[PDB]
C-alpha cells in the first residue's frame, strides 16, 4: 500500500492490471496474474501482490476434461513478487462476457479466458458467475458485441499422463510441486464415469453438450475461425 | 492500505512499537515495530513488523552482558495477522536513554543499542538509529527529558547455563534452535572466547576495561538511586 505505479522495462503496471510473471518452473510459460497490491520495502526494492491463475497443465482434473484454447483458472493463491519478476502484460477475460463480444481495448499482450475457479484443495472446478467479486476492490469496461460466437474446446494437454492401470474409481491425484514460489510443475489427470447432463460442456465423454461449444472432432464445416482464440462465428 | 488498526480497543499505527504473540512462548511476546498495514481480499488485516530479539534468543559469547530489558534489531521483517498484537510497548535507543528519558506516556520499556547479525552472529552498535525506522517517521524528532549522571547495570546472560561442559575458547560459533518458524528462535546458544583488554561498549564481563556509565555484576557501588525496572542508577 505504498505505490500507485511501477515501471519495468519501460512499461507501467497498476493495481488491477493483468500481467505475466516469471515462472521458476518454466521460464517460457509465465504465470498469468492480476496485481492486487504494490509497495516498497525498507531496502528500496519494489514489490507487488498478484492473484495467481493456473494454466490447464497446472491443474489436477479428469482426463476427459476439455479446455478453451487460452484458458486459465483462478486460484486462492495471492503471492508476493519482486516487481522485477514482471515479464510483460496480458489480459484475462471472463468467459460469459467473451461469449457476447470482444473487449473494447488494445490488448498489450496475449488474451486469456476464464470460466472457472479452481479448488486446489479438493481439485474441483467451479464456474465463476460473479467476476466482479474476483477483482481488487478498487477496480470493481465496454464490449464489442459479436453475433453468435462459439468456442472450440480441446483435450487435456496432460492427458498422456493417465496411469496405465487407471480406473474410474481412482483417488484424485496430487499435483507435482517444483519451486515453492511457483505454480505446480505439472498437474495430473484421473478417470471417472461418463455423464448424461453436461450444462457447461466440461467433458468430452458426456452425452450432452451446450450449443456454443464445439467438442474435438465435431468438426463444423461453415463459419469463420479465429485460429488464435479458437472462436468461430456464423 | 490501512491508516490504523484497532486491536482490543487499542490503535496501532506504522512506526509503532508493539508486542506480538510468540508461538514459542505465550508470555514472552515478540518485540516489533509496525512498518506497514493492509487488508487482504478476504478482509483480514495484516501488518509487517521488524523483529527485535531478546538476549535468550540470540547466539553470543557466554560472558556477554545485557541491560535490563535489552533488545537487539534483526533483519526479520515478518507479516502478521493484526490479531497477533497483544499490546503496545516502546523501544528506546541506548545513546538517547543514556542522556535522558523519553518525553511521553504505552507499555513495557525496552532499550536497544546493538543490531544482531543472524548469519555471522555479530553484534554491531547502532549509530544511525533513524536508518532502522520506517521511512515515514525516519526524520521525526522526539522529545527527551535530560537526566544527569545516569549509569546502567548490566546483567549476565540468561542462557549462560547452556554452555556445553567441554567448551573451549576456540569452538565454532553454535547455531540457535528454532521452534516455530513463524516465531523467533526458541532459544539461542552460548560459546567461549578469549577475553580482551579494551572494551568500549562494556560488552563482556571478562574485559579489563569498562566505560564509566556501565556497572558490571559484583561491582556494586555503595551510593546512589537505583531504578529497579530499568537497572538505571543516578547520582
Ligand atoms: Cl474435472
Ligand atoms: Cl521474489
Ligand atoms: Cl481449430
Ligand atoms: Cl558476543
Ligand atoms: Cl499469522
From Swiss-Prot, chain B:
This is Chromatin structure-remodeling complex subunit RSC2. The chain holds residues 401 to 634 of 889 of the full protein. Residues 10-127 form the BAH domain. Component of the chromatin structure remodeling complex (RSC), which is involved in transcription regulation and nucleosome positioning. RSC is responsible for the transfer of a histone octamer from a nucleosome core particle to naked DNA. The reaction requires ATP and involves an activated RSC-nucleosome intermediate. Remodeling reaction also involves DNA translocation, DNA twist and conformational change. The modification Phosphotyrosine is found at residue 213. Component of the two forms of the RSC complex composed of at least either RSC1 or RSC2, and ARP7, ARP9, LDB7, NPL6, RSC3, RSC30, RSC4, RSC58, RSC6, RSC8, RSC9, SFH1, STH1, HTL1 and probably RTT102. The complexes interact with histone and histone variant components of centromeric chromatin. Present with 2330 molecules/cell in log phase SD medium. Changing residue 70 to K: In dpm3; defective in plasmid maintenance. Belongs to the RSC1 family. It is found in: Nucleus. The lineage of its organism: Eukaryota, Fungi, Dikarya, Ascomycota, Saccharomycotina. Residues 202-225 are annotated as: Disordered. It comes from the Eukaryota. Disruption phenotype: Heterochromatin spreading downstream of the silent mating-type locus HMR.
